[PDB]
Amino acid sequence: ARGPKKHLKRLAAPHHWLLDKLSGCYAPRPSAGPHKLRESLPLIVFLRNRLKYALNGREVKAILMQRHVKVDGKVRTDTTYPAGFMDVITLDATNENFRLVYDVKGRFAVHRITDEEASYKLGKVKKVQLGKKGVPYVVTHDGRTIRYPDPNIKVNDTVKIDLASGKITDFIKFDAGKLVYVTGGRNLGRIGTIVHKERHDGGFDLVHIKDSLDNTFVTRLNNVFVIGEQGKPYISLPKGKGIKLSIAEERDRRRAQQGL
Amino acid sequence: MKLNISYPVNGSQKTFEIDDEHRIRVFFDKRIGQEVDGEAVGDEFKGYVFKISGGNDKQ
């Protein structure tokens, strides 16, 4: 009440951060940024908890302000900077890069990309609109406004950013039989190929997605994220490829690995 | 009462006590900004002209 909140109590934090219940009363409240705080991964959570490069928040601040970590090629010394889906994190040391994608178990995963993959990213068009002076623009999911887009670009389409300059190199239309990603709902982390989409005027269009080995499911259009055509994706996939194999099947792989 | 009389061109300021309350009534029923002679105020102020800039009552 009386104004915006500044504290995020622990157990109110998003569960996919995988914060422990003890060792703290509060959780890192992500700052205002490109991503909504529910589906954003703060740099303190990614460093201290996911990468174990820091032991405490003070060391996290020491890492951040030195101009070590650059998010999408920009330093962003904010501790709770809301890094989200498809974001590219480059580290000056160790000569390696991470992309931020979910795993099939519905949480952001440490995925290592090369430099050529780090040199770009894919985003989802939230809207296409004419601005002042009639310049058209596309708004991605990460709050990027790019002027003069291709006229064939429509809403919920995928655009490849150059990440060093605010331009689009190419795009993928929203059409049937194109490999996609899921960023919402119970299917958080899946990767599949479209079957069709239902019209459903007035709100909440529904899309039917088929997995690699025919695990057919449906989800809202809001959660869909086109990533390529049949095979040959534009983004290297994380460990798992978002398939959601059964509990008994992963039990088989675990007893295979430790039972040899 | 006491008079915080200040000469501004050199920034000098001194306090003079003026008893004989039947002579401080030249100040009476005047207000800030009203010029008053120095002759009635005192036998020391021949030709000095003052003006009221402020004050502090008892309390």
Add this chain to the structure above:
Amino acid sequence: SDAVTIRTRKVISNPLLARKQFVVDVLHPNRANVSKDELREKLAEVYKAEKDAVSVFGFRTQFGGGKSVGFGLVYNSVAEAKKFEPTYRLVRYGLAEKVEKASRQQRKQKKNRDKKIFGTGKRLAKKVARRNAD
């Protein structure tokens, strides 16, 4: 000999802090525990360090004694160790000295006393001096 048999595990290079982190297990039969200074020294001649770039944590001994496990950092020099490590552990290891601060309550009380003062206060100091010397 005593045969501590100090083994380092979970070793990770962290050039982001110019240090290597690890957990360390020490096996000390018929011995209570291991001293931090001697453990830091042994880590120094293991890593060809100079006994000052080494920091240690924990060493929660198992039940019944005989084995301790704790965290450890080995740096590249004194300079980044002194810039990255906390003051309290610097005072532990003897590089720096504990700063003589007043207790927290009287520090706060003095700050609240200074809140009631506008400016330096030499004006009111000489005014109360005049009132005391009238």
Add this chain to the structure above:
RNA sequence: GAAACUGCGAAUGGCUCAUUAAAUCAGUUAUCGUUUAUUUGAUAGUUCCUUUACUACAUGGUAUAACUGUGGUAAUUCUAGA
């Protein structure tokens, strides 16, 4: 780097359950009915005195805190005159 001016915060947190019975709240909606500091992305070649006033843009001036001093009140994080 004391002080002070400026900026920002102080609307968060923390506490309590008095009020409150379609009120609050829960799930679910709408803003094609609005405000939004700050973060992130983009984003002002046009200022011709409100023209026959282009007079400094190698860059306009006022008035003040702080500080120096005179003080008043028993007293307040009171303050006035220069």
Add this chain to the structure above:
RNA sequence: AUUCAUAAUAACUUUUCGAAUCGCAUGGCCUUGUGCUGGCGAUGGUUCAUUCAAAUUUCUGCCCUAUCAACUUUCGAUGGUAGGAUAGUGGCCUACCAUGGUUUCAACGGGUAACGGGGAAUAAGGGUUCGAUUCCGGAGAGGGAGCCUGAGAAACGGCUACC
């Protein structure tokens, strides 16, 4: 789905913004000069988008009571038109007009030793009872009312008045 986004014409403005700001390196060309030209940032700064929000908001769902059966409406009750006011919709307020609106499918009134919920105890199944209290939402800072500064307060470790 629009009188949308935009764009064009005609004008209007206590004429809003369009850098008289700060730190490092201080290069290139000679017309060798208080010559020309230059990066890394920081704080700013109209507008759009994004984010953290907020405010209103649709549907459905609350305990006991008829020893509570009618209730609301000159003093806004329910609508219409226009205006005012607000960030904006809207009887929110005003003027004029119409006479509506709820109710035994329990309105209205009264009581609550009532903050609501996630939940807790018990539990064959079905249920019963509790939830001031860790999380979320609301409300309040002795009781009312009013208000300044601000993006955000009807703030109280802000102010003003009364008790």
